[PDB]
Amino acid sequence: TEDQRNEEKAQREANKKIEKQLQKDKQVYRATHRLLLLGAGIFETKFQVDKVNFHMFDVGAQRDERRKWIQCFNDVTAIIFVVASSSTNRLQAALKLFDSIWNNKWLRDTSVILFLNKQDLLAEKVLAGKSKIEDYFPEFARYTTPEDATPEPGEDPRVTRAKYFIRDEFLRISTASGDGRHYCYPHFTCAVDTENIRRVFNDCRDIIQRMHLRQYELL
Amino acid sequence: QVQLQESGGGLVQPGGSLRLSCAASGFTFSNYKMNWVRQAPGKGLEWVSDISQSGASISYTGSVKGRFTISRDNAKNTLYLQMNSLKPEDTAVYYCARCPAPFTRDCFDVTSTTYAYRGQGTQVTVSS
Amino acid sequence: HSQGTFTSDYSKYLDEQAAKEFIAWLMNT
Amino acid sequence: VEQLKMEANIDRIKVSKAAADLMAYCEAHAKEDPLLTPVPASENPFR
Amino acid sequence: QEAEQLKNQIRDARKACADATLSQITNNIDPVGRIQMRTRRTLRGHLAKIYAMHWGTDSRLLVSASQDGKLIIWDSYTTNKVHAIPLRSSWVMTCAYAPSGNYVACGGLDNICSIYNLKTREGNVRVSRELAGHTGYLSCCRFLDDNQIVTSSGDTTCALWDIETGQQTTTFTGHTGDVMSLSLAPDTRLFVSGACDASAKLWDVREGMCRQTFTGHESDINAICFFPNGNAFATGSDDATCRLFDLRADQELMTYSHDNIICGITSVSFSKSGRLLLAGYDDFNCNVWDALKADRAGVLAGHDNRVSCLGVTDDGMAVATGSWDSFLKIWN
Amino acid sequence: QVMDFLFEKWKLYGDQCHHNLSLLPPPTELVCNRTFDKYSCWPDTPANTTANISCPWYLPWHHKVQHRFVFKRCGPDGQWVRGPRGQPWRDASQCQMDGEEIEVQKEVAKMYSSFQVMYTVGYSLSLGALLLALAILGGLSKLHCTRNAIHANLFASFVLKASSVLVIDGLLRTRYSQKIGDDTWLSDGAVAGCRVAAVFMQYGIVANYCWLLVEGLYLHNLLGLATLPERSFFSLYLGIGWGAPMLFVVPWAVVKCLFENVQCWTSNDNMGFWWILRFPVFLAILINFFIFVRIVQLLVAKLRARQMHYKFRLAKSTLTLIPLLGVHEVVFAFVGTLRSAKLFFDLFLSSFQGLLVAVLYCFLNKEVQSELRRRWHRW
């Protein structure tokens, strides 16, 4: 009786202290936002914006095919997707990868942010001739500025036309099959880790608010 | 055994036409998407076209849009590609890829590694 | 919060009706 | 390429008698499987 | 290449052997009947999705590794968290419990297999050795003993180590695509490996090359497990079917498929006697295929999310299934 | 009220009449003997003469006009129009309630009964739906998360309020649906039950509005936070939801017991002890309406961009959120009969609020729909 109740109580005390530790750890686990960084197709960086912990996980030590190890990022709040707009034929591959991510069985509940890097390099790439955006996307030749959205000042209308064409192409890929909480947040940038953390934090806040609203069926 | 034999190809004068046939053996061809991936010499693999199971969302890369067509016969279990208005930079080696996700439209079949569900491919060249 | 007002009015209405009953039997007898 | 070479010389085993042996083992060890036949809760630690 | 005629003769060998299969041998065998599976206990307490689990030899303590950087060791008899090891890497894909119980191995996306010492002289747990050398992610690792551990990575390779020195004693290579599953034969001398090429390769630890290759699937193989006899093994792939291969027959023996299942098998495991075959699918269920007649005879639908791992106790008295809802259930 | 005042006045006037009859010489000397029917206070009159008897002012039904003198005819002994009880109570009876005020008699009873049978059946349906909601949610796997925990416990608050209202309805009826006819006074044992039922029902009302406030605060905090809640605050919310009514209902009950003790605490006379109980409800409604307008201002922003279109969703979202926050009361406060139509609307909505919330936040949503479908497929 007691010869077993002693170790039963010891195990109960161990369970109690371990449960207390788990409760303490959950408060910081649920208070931090996990992300994921991947480019066109170091391991973890922790930063903070407005007292919110962001754990941005940068894969890249793995192989090229990603149909198996990407499912683990299904619970990630937002997948950051950086794409080089300079190109050979890198942009089409990036777009196809984005489509595969969007229409994934397990990743269809995960929102995606987009970062169109190599912004300034496109200005010289559209004229060098090595990789012509018009040549590789003939439909862009007849394509003009979509709407009266204000571009950044001090730039040629051609480069903003190209960047908006890429943006609306990605948006067309995103909105073709919308079923879940997945949302696409496009952005324009030149260099990472420079005022982009604010945009990432704002988009993550929007994702969390939309998630809560969907929980309450208000949206 | 997932086998994707590829035929056709060869040397074709610029501006001509060609037919590529892909015979799939070892799996239910009518349950998977199908893709073509081309590799120019000294360059990485690039996706060209994709077709659904019976064919409802057929897409092509912008470079060859409006000049190449893709079709599939499930009863004959074969994938056909018609290449028209050929250009010299279209010279490459073509692979018939079956991205591995039945009854779903998601797949990652562009990698240059030893992709298991991609055929040996065939060579197409453009003369002067 | 008008439910409290409604039930108070109800109680007052029952009271004035019971007053009728009281004065009825008294006058009758 | 050597793996395919050294597997083409292994012994050939009759599938019929292999399946018969597997079935015989399965039926012989069936009494020791406390999952096919439900076990009384007296000797069942999960209850 | 001179291998087309070799494939021809190997296919002919398999075909000559392919007569009087178990499918029509086991017509006379009586069906096992419907099996009533009830969730005995719910081992709640994980934060993120449970992604791997393993059973101890004592059939009492089960280890479960989730994606919250946590690796719990539950006593199932009393449902008590004996240990809670905080992991350095949040992303974890596998976990193994040593047969002696001294050590627990964890392998995640960090390309590193970490061995944790549980009941060392100090009460607190810590790392014994931190194995490294794999380039891709580690998908499944299992303990041969307290000395050597065999693991399978995502770079088309498997590594047999020696923990005391942390060196690759043997490197098994020859697979194409990511290697997903890993199983050990009862004799601990041969082991099957499933990869993302619809091919399962039988390797010998003492040699280091592909002893045998078994191909019959049509998509990525996600789980694999030996028959208790050790002369056969079952394989669950993304083809939404389970195939029972055979070491001696060198070919497929039977397939476990149904018309209405459009979901790939995530985990698979036999029973103590091997009559049952419990396979955890992506449709949030766990189906018990009668491994001798290929007819489903039970569904375990206690999970609201996909089941990640599915272990069976050594004595066969229970079956514990994890899932992506952070809830691990015990069935009997 | 009216019963207590009438009884006290009858006591304080019957003794005076008896003392006046004792002061008067015997009414048997060839005079009309006065009958102690505890009603008419006619003194000794001459045999067979119709004395000018004036109706007393002790009747509360004569506040506007407390004077009525009529000729009462008696027999030589004193036998007026009596017989058994009183054929016509001598000849004086027109001093009761006049027919001018008879419109409030036997005519408003029909509409009161209609409203009664409407809101009681509404409360019964509400409590049935809420009990079903607790059965399918509270006892099932969805019990540990803060959102559905607060939802289920607020459903329990609605159940408590509805049960208290129905129970007190029955009590009040059986305070007057038992007229002892020739009746003494009402039973003392039922008075304590009436008082405890009244205080319990007030506690239920205040708890319901307080938890509407709790739901509003929880939603606002959840949407204002930049991530998942680091701390549950569940204990704090439960405390501010349960104990806050006890901060008001117990003081109201003790003030009613010590200062304005009456036959039943349902009746309200002085607003001094009524506003101290209305104040928490008004504060909860105001704060919840502010939270509602804030959430609407947020939701329009989330739908004015990044979405493909949208007025239907915004309208549907508002109609699925007002009952949860209970902010429709403020509309009635701001608001073709000014009485009948208004009452019917307000009582109907108040009764059916629990039913609508139970059917909306526990059956319609997909997180319960999928679970119920899976459970039925298994069963």
Structure-token pair, residue D20: 């018969």
Q: What is the largest CA-CA distance in chain D?
A: 57
Distance between CA atoms of residues E300 and E36, nearest Å? 9
Nearest to C8 by CA among D11, A8, E243, F265: F265
What contacts A122, CB < 8 A, 6 or more positions away?
Answer: A85, A86, A133, A159, A162, A163
Structure-token pair, residue B101: 């996700």
CB contact under 8 A, A62 and E67: no
Distance between CA atoms of residues E229 and D26, nearest Å? 8
CB contact under 8 A, F267 and C15: yes
- Cα F209–chain centre separation: 16
Nearest to A93 by CA among B50, E154, E176: B50
According to DSSP, residue E318 is labeled -
Nearest to E328 by CA among E75, E59, E36: E75
Name the method of structure determination: cryo-EM
CA-to-CA separations, D19 to E26, E112, E228, in angstroms, rounded? 9, 40, 14
C13 CB burial (10 A radius; 0-12, 13-18, 19+): middle
Phi, psi torsion values for E191, nearest 5 degrees: -150, 140
Residue F98 CB coordination number (10 Å)? 12
Distance between CA atoms of residues A122 and A128, nearest Å? 10
- Parallel, antiparallel or unpaired: strands E138-143 and E232-237: unpaired
Contacts of residues E34-38 at CB distance under 8 Å and 24 or more positions apart, as own/partner, are E34/E297, E34/E298, E35/D35, E35/D36, E35/E276, E35/E288, E35/E297, E35/E298, E36/D38, E36/E298, E37/E288, E37/E298, E37/E299, E37/E300, E37/E319, E37/E331, E37/E332, E38/E331, E38/E332
Q: Which residue of chain B comes nearest to A89, CA vs CA? A: B46
Q: Please give the tally of structural domains in chain E.
A: 1
> Residue ranges of the alpha helices (H) in E18-59?
22-25
DSSP string, chain D: -HHHHHHTTSPP--HHHHHHHHHHHHHHSGGG-TTTSPPPGGG-S--
Looking at residue A186, its amino acid is P
Q: Which of residues 4-33 of D touch E (CB under 8 A)?
A: 4-8, 10-16, 18-23, 25-26, 29-30, 32-33
Nearest to D14 by CA among E246, F45, E260, A82: E246
F103 touching C (Cβ < 8 Å): no
CA-to-CA separations, B93 to A65, A136, B20, in angstroms, rounded? 20, 19, 11
State the SS3 of chain F.
Answer: CCHHHHHHHHHHHHHHHHHHHHHCCCCCCCEECCCCCCCCCCCCEECCCCEEEECCCCCHHHCCCCCCEEEECCCCCCCCCCCCCCCCCCCCCCCCCCHHHHHHCCCHHHHHHHHHHHHHHHHHHHHHHHHHHHHHHCCCCCCCCHHHHHHHHHHHHHHHHHHHHHHHHHHHHHHHCCCCCCCCCCCHHHHHHHHHHHHHHHHHHHHHHHHHHHHHHHHHHHHHCCCCCCCCCHHHHHHHHHHHHHCCHHHHHHHHHHHCCCCCCCCCCCCHHHHHHHHHHHHHHHHHHHHHHHHHHHHHHHHHCCCCCCHHHHHHHHHCCHHHHCCCHHHHHHCCCCCHHHHHHHHHHHHHHHHHHHHHHCCCCHHHHHHHHHHHHHC
Structure-token pair, residue B22: 């892909």
**Contact call for residues F196 and F272 (beta carbons, < 8 A):** no
Residue F314 CB coordination number (10 Å)? 17
Those chains having 3 or more beta-carbon pairs within 8 angstroms of chain A are: B, E, F
Indicate which CATH number applies to the domain containing E84.
2.130.10.10
Helix F108-137 vs helix C2-28: angle between axes, to the nearest 10 degrees? 130
Cα-Cα-Cα-Cα dihedral sign, residues B50, B51, B52, B57: positive
**Rg of chain A on CA atoms, in Å:** 22
Distance between CA atoms of residues E198 and E236, nearest Å? 10
Distance between CA atoms of residues B78 and B67, nearest Å? 21
Distance between CA atoms of residues F148 and E229, nearest Å? 49
What dihedral do alpha carbons A207, A208, A213, A217 form, nearest 10°?
A: 80
Q: How far is E214 from chain A (nearest CA, A)?
A: 21
Distance between CA atoms of residues F103 and F98, nearest Å? 10
What contacts E82, CB < 8 A, 6 or more positions away?
Answer: A11, A14, E61, E73, E74, E75
Q: Three-state SS for B119?
A: coil
Q: What is the largest CA-CA distance in chain C?
A: 44
According to DSSP, residue E12 is labeled H
Nearest to B46 by CA among A184, A89, F349: A89
B112 touching E (Cβ < 8 Å): no
What contacts F332, CB < 8 A, 6 or more positions away?
Answer: C2, F342, F345, F346
DSSP H/E element including E255: strand E252-256
Of the candidates E209, E253, E276, the beta carbon closest to that of D35 is on E276
Distance between CA atoms of residues A66 and B45, nearest Å? 16
What contacts F328, CB < 8 A, 6 or more positions away?
Answer: F322, F349
- How many D-E residue pairs are in contact by the CB < 8 A criterion? 128
**Contact call for residues B83 and B124 (beta carbons, < 8 A):** yes
**Contact call for residues E303 and F371 (beta carbons, < 8 A):** no
Distance between CA atoms of residues E147 and A23, nearest Å? 35
Nearest to A198 by CA among A36, A29, A34, A54: A54
Q: How far is B53 from chain A (nearest CA, A)?
A: 16
B83 forms bridges with which residues in the sheet?
B18, B68
DSSP H/E element including A9: helix A2-29
E59 CB burial (10 A radius; 0-12, 13-18, 19+): middle
Distance between CA atoms of residues B94 and F339, nearest Å? 83
Looking at residue F328, its amino acid is H
**Contact call for residues E284 and D43 (beta carbons, < 8 A):** no
Which residues in A148-170 are b (16+ Cβ under 10 Å) and which e?
Answer: eeeeeeeeeeebbbbbbbbbebb
What dihedral do alpha carbons F354, F356, F360, F361 form, nearest 10°?
A: -10
According to DSSP, residue E287 is labeled E
Phi, psi torsion values for A116, nearest 5 degrees: -85, 85
DSSP string, B51-112: E-SSSSS-EE-TTTTTTEEEEEETTTTEEEEEEES--GGG-EEEEEE--S-TTSS------S
What contacts C19, CB < 8 A, 6 or more positions away?
Answer: F2, F3, F6, F60, F61
DSSP H/E element including A206: helix A196-215
What dihedral do alpha carbons E48, E268, D46, E123 form, nearest 10°?
A: -50
Where does residue B58 fall: left (phi above 0), alpha (psi -120 to 50 degrees), or beta otherwise?
beta
Contacts of residues E96-100 at CB distance under 8 Å and 24 or more positions apart, as own/partner, are E96/E54, E96/E63, E96/E141, E96/E142, E96/E143, E96/E149, E97/E54, E97/E55, E97/E56, E97/E57, E97/E61, E97/E62, E97/E63, E97/E73, E97/E143, E98/E143, E98/E145, E98/E146, E99/E57, E99/E143, E99/E145, E100/E57, E100/E145, E100/E146
E222 CB burial (10 A radius; 0-12, 13-18, 19+): buried
Of the candidates A50, A210, A219, the beta carbon closest to that of F317 is on A219
CA-to-CA separations, B40 to A89, B8, B44, B92, E298, in angstroms, rounded? 11, 17, 7, 4, 53
**Contact call for residues A162 and A126 (beta carbons, < 8 A):** yes
Those chains having 3 or more beta-carbon pairs within 8 angstroms of chain B are: A, E
Distance between CA atoms of residues F127 and F209, nearest Å? 17
Those chains having 3 or more beta-carbon pairs within 8 angstroms of chain F are: A, C, E
Distance between CA atoms of residues F44 and F35, nearest Å? 10
**Contact call for residues B86 and B14 (beta carbons, < 8 A):** yes
Q: How far is D40 from chain E (nearest CA, A)?
A: 11
Sequence length of chain F is: 379
**Rg of chain E on CA atoms, in Å:** 19
DSSP H/E element including E50: strand E50-55
**Contact call for residues E102 and E149 (beta carbons, < 8 A):** no
Distance between CA atoms of residues F282 and B7, nearest Å? 81
What contacts F202, CB < 8 A, 6 or more positions away?
Answer: C4, F249, F252, F253, F277
Distance between CA atoms of residues A215 and F151, nearest Å? 13
A68 touching E (Cβ < 8 Å): yes
- Parallel, antiparallel or unpaired: strands A32-38 and A52-57: parallel
F120 CB burial (10 A radius; 0-12, 13-18, 19+): middle
| Resolution stated for this PDB structure, in Å | 3.4
B100 touching E (Cβ < 8 Å): yes
E-state strands within A50-120 = 52-57, 78-84, 111-117
**Rg of chain C on CA atoms, in Å:** 13
Looking at residue A57, its amino acid is F
E151 forms bridges with which residues in the sheet?
E141, E159
What contacts A68, CB < 8 A, 6 or more positions away?
Answer: E139, E154, E178, E180, E196, E220
**Domains of chain F, earliest start first:** 2-102 (4.10.1240.10), 103-378 (1.20.1070.10)
CA-to-CA separations, F60 to A10, E162, F186, in angstroms, rounded? 77, 104, 20
Q: Between chain C and chain D, are at least 3 CB pairs below 8 A?
A: no
Phi, psi torsion values for F71, nearest 5 degrees: -85, 125
**Contact call for residues F39 and F17 (beta carbons, < 8 A):** no
Domain containing E105 equals 3-331
**Contact call for residues B49 and B35 (beta carbons, < 8 A):** yes
Phi, psi torsion values for F292, nearest 5 degrees: -65, -45
DSSP string, E101-130: SSEEEEEETTS-EEEEESSSSSSS-EEEEE
Q: Three-state SS for B25?
A: strand
Nearest to E51 by CA among E238, E309, E313, E303: E309
F52 forms bridges with which residues in the sheet?
F71
Distance between CA atoms of residues F377 and F379, nearest Å? 5
Residue F328 CB coordination number (10 Å)? 16
Distance between CA atoms of residues E313 and E332, nearest Å? 11
Structure-token pair, residue B118: 């991609």
**Contact call for residues E268 and E180 (beta carbons, < 8 A):** no
Of the candidates A96, A101, A104, the beta carbon closest to that of B110 is on A96
B53 CB burial (10 A radius; 0-12, 13-18, 19+): middle
**Domains of chain B, earliest start first:** 3-126 (2.60.40.10)
CB contact under 8 A, A31 and F228: yes
Q: Which residues of F touch C20 (CB under 8 A)?
A: 97, 105
Nearest to E309 by CA among E291, E289, E290, E327: E327
Residue showing tokens 């009590």: F171
Distance between CA atoms of residues E114 and E134, nearest Å? 12
Q: How far is A124 from chain F (nearest CA, A)?
A: 31
What contacts F256, CB < 8 A, 6 or more positions away?
Answer: F262, F265, F273
Of the candidates A64, A135, A138, the beta carbon closest to that of B112 is on A64
Structure-token pair, residue F119: 């809101």
Query: Within a 13 Å sphere around the CA of F204, how many CA atoms are in the beta-carbon half?
Result: 23
